[PDB]
Design a protein around this ligand. Structure first.
Ligand SMILES: C[C@]12CC[C@@H]3c4ccc(O)cc4CC[C@H]3[C@@H]1CC[C@@H]2O
Ligand SMILES: C[C@]12CC[C@@H]3c4ccc(O)cc4CC[C@H]3[C@@H]1CC[C@@H]2O
Lengths: 196, 195
């Protein structure tokens, strides 16, 4: 509860001031913990961020058993569960808020950004594996262009998150995300321009 | 009106290298090789430079429309917008700043409000293209236009965001037309965008 208390203080501070303008010492103030104890648990600020990203991912994967007839069906559930969690889980809300809006791509953030890309590369391969299992079960056609489909998926879903935050949550994500996900899946299943 | 454009581009250039939050007027005026006062005459603050930059992006897009049916004109304008992102350094840098170097902190609050104003304008313009397209029967009378405009913007936002934040990992020239085609098809045919 010491290591956790520090990450939530990192998250709360990142959300307030942004990643670049946040210091390993002002995180200590929020957590109310000596810097040597902080250094005990994490080397530097990228570490706090890497742990926040890992917690987000753990939460998604831990629920996948509870989301799970067939794996392409599980994907649908996991996508829908993701967007509900954005609304109702304050940790996932703030973290994605930070990732899309509070993490500017300047040299000051270079190390944090490389951490983001490590986790996104893991997610990119998660998608490929799901597409691959789905072709094998014949939920997707055998000539599905998997490299293109992966860009299409990340593009479609990133766009909805970006739009939602940028608008200031000015539309109902609970009604809109299922429409968007519905259209996307239909396109992966049926549209010719995602075939090789 | 040519002094204004030189001050504007020094800001765009400085915003691109440092981001908006860390740029100061001093550095802009320096980059432009003019005094603080002379900059101040044309532009009071960074908000006003960013606003003018955003205004010039929109002017470029609108001027090229002026040179089929409007629903066909829309498709062409989406396609050319993404070509322009590759081949036009000002549209590249600007959208790079808007999506990657425009943090949503309190110091940037005024710039963000600027950005929302222009995004609102574009939303109204998209809403009109959909309204005209319906009456010309390029889209169905039953088209859910409120959802459709969210759908169009997040489709395009997603491409731009994904291309910039991945370090331009894929070829926008092959990807953008394929995304825009699929979008166009869904607007015309997908039943999720109706009723
Ligand atoms: C699509 C995203 C990457 C891939 C993620 C994934 C990847 C595999 C999987 O089985 C489920 C999910 C759900 C959340 C998805 C993410 C939501 C937004 C992000 O871009
Ligand atoms: C979707 C955007 C706003 C609406 C823009 C528009 C709005 C109306 C129109 O007739 C054409 C275009 C092309 C470019 C579009 C933009 C590309 C990026 C921007 O977010």
């Amino acid at each position: 509860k010491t290591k956790e208390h520090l990450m939530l203080a990192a998250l709360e501070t990142f959300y307030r001031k942004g990643i670049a303008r946040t210091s390993l010492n002002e995180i200590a103030q929020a957590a109310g913990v000596t810097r040597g104890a902080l250094y005990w648990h994490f080397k530097n600020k990228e570490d706090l961020f890497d742990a926040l990203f890992q917690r987000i991912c753990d939460d998604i994967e831990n629920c996948i058993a509870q989301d799970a007839g067939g794996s392409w069906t599980v994907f649908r559930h996991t996508l829908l569960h993701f967007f509900e969690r954005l609304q109702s889980n304050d940790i996932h809300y703030k973290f994605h808020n930070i990732l899309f809006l509070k993490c500017e791509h300047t040299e000051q953030n270079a190390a944090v950004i490389a951490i983001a890309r490590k986790h996104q590369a893991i997610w990119r391969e998660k998608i490929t594996a799901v597409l691959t299992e789905a072709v094998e079960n014949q939920d997707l056609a055998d000539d599905l262009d998997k490299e293109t489909a992966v860009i299409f998926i990340k593009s479609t879903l990133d766009g909805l998150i970006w739009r939602w935050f940028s608008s200031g949550e000015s539309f109902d994500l609970g009604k809109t995300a299922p429409r968007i996900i519905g259209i996307m899946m239909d396109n992966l299943e049926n549209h010719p321009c995602l075939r090789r």
